[PDB]
Each structure stands twice: as C-alpha cells, then as structure tokens.
Amino acid sequence: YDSRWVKRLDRLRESKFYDPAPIIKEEEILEADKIHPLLKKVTPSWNSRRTGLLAYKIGMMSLWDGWGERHAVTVCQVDRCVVMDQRTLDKDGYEACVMGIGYKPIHKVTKPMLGVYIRSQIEPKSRIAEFKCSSDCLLPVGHEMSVRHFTPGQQVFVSGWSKDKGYLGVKKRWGFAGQNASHGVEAKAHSSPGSIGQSKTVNVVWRFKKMAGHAGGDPRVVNCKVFRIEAQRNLIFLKGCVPGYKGSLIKISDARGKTHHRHNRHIPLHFPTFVPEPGVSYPVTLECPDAEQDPFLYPEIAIADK
Amino acid sequence: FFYYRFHKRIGKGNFNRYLEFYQKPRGIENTLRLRYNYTPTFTAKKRSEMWKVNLVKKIAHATDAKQVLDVWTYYRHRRTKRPYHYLLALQRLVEVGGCDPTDFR
C-alpha cells in the first residue's frame, strides 16, 4: 500500500532478498499419517469418470527432452487442494465432490464461513470449486490431492479465464481491414467500420454484430500435455499455453471425445487416485517418454511436374 | 402487477421407453409465486382474510390432539403467522393430554 515510486523501487530490489533453493531428494517414502483410511482401489467401468484439479499459473519455461528438442511448458502448482464435502442422489440429488484451494487471512473471513472451516478441520480457503464425476469415484472427505493423479504423457483439458485489455476499437478487437492511408481518403474513414446493415428492406441490425467494446475477460479452454511432475513441491509442467494471469485459477481435467479416443486409449491411469502402499518408496520426478522415430530426420520428397 | 410473466419451458428429460411405475413424482411442476393483476372484490378479500379468526375459532373448538393437528395442517399455506398462534396451539395441545412429538404435523 505504498506509493508508486516506492513500489517501483521494491520491484527492482526484491531480487536481493531471495531465500536459498531447497534440497530436492531422489526418493520418497510415505507413512500411515498421510493416507486416508477410507481410501481403497476400485475397478473402473464403462460409465465411470474421474475428478478434476485446480491450479495456479506461475509462468512459462523452456525445457529440452531425450531427443534434444526444446519445448515451451507452463508451470502449475496445486496449492493444497483438499476435498470438503460430497454430494449424493439421496441427500442432494446429484453426485459431485467439492474441493478447496488457497489461503486467506483470518482477519478477512466472515463468521459463517469460519463455521464451515471449523467443521472441516482445515485452514481458511481462498476458492472453492465442484466437480461432477461418477458415483464410483467419490473421494473421501479430507483427502489431499497430489500431482500423481495425472500420468506423464497424457492429454489434459484445461479451462480458464482470458486477460483483460480494456476498451478497444473495431480495428483493434476484431481486426478490421479499414481504408487506405492515401488516395483521397477522409480522416474518419481511416479506421471506420463501413457498412453495418442493409437498406430499408431490413430496418433492424442482426444480433451478435461485430462492434467496438471492452475486450478480454472470457472463458477459454485448451488441450495440454503432461511433460513433467514434481512430488516434493507439487508441481506440474504442461506443454502448450494456458490463459489467465500469472496466478489466476485454472481447472484441469481429462480428455474428452476425440482427444480421448485418439490419445488417451493405451495409457494406464489410476482411476480413483494415487494409492501408495505403506513400506514402499516412490519416485519424486517423472519425465515424459521419448518418441519412437528420430525427430531430426529429413527424408526425401519427390517433386515431379506433370 | 401490470405484467405477470409465466412460461413453461421444455425441460430436459428422458421419456422414451418409459416404464409405468405406480409412484409419485419428485414435486409439482409449477412453483412460481402466483400474483394477481387485478384488485380483489369484497368477497374475495373477506375469504382471504377470514383465516385469522377461523384458525383460533377452530383451535378453541377442537377437543383432541388429532383435531388440533388437523386444524393446524389445514391452514398450512397461510402466511404471516404471529407468535401467539403457536402459544395457543401449544396450550391446547398440553391441555388435551399431550401429543406426538414425532408427528409430521
């Protein structure tokens, strides 16, 4: 809450106050204190669907691969995603799971909200979302989600909000052609929209007409690829691009339709969740398998005129 | 109420190959508040307003918890129930020789 010129100097000076990097291990062992007693393995069915996850956009990065091809990947962090409540047909009328994410100061949370958290036995949350899934994939209350839910090398469905650009013109928003810069052209005609309708035969402008206005701030969805995951820090690297600001909430789910059919067919995935067995170690870091063929192979393409 | 909006939309469902089951549905189709667009007459108003007196009158006349409960039930839809109404019913219920707490009524 400082001044402009104080904030600007802060922005520059922040770099000098960075804590040392953690120490990442090669192996991980879990005990009974991190496992839901109610958690068990369930065989999937033909009409079974899994749950989604929430993430925060951190930033972009470039990473190599086994063949040596560089790719751009976005980093996402699951900020302690925990199940709050469940929905049943008898109780509510539909199967769903409610989850929470984030943290809020106690000096900002209302009493009715704090009542929920007391029951839940969890710290205050910033955001709450819900997922629709099949009845056979209802996770127990209080279970903490992990990055291990998605296996590397599978297609994911990512949803989020776009950025904001304020007010923009017709030429700026849509990308109109306009008029020439010369050859006897009026000032106003430079960036004018031109015809916007028909003659007296149609006295009404059709709905959904492309016009000037505030731009940005819309929902958008995109496909992504799981490139790398981290268990320690709970990090996920997604191949492609994700909308929203560097910190905005984003939803991640499995493939749907063609995406599933074509890609997510031969990939074994833990349907309910990751279920570690007490007394056994697990990897910390998992990488995407390399391709089959050499990417750096330029065969000959015949060019014959006829 | 110059204009009262009310439309019956085509809701989502699956009636194809429907099997006749002798059971009641979830709930009524129409739930929207009914608002008249005209001033009522003297008889209408009277009929609408007589409940306030009839409730008490029948409560008093009642001679058993069954009757009491029935009376109460009949004036279910009757909005704007004053506290004293409850008190009266309670006193009558105790005088009659008790009641059934478990009763839906």
Binding site: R207, F208, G213, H214, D218, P219, R220 | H7, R9
Partner: peptide
C-alpha cells in the same frame, strides 16, 4: 474484378463464447 470467396465466414460449429451471447442467454431466464 477478382474476389475471393470467404467461405470460412460460414462457420456454424464450435464457435467461441462472447459477452453478447452470454447476455442473450441470460435474458432468456438463465
């Protein structure tokens, strides 16, 4: 004169979401 036929403009499947559309939906007892 020459004129390219912009048939792409005729798209009627998998259209993006817009505030106009949203408001249209809303106004219809959303």
């Amino acid at each position: 004169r020459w004129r390219p036929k912009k048939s792409y403009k005729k798209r009627t499947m998998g259209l993006p979401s817009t505030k106009a559309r949203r408001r249209w939906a809303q106004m219809r007892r959303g």
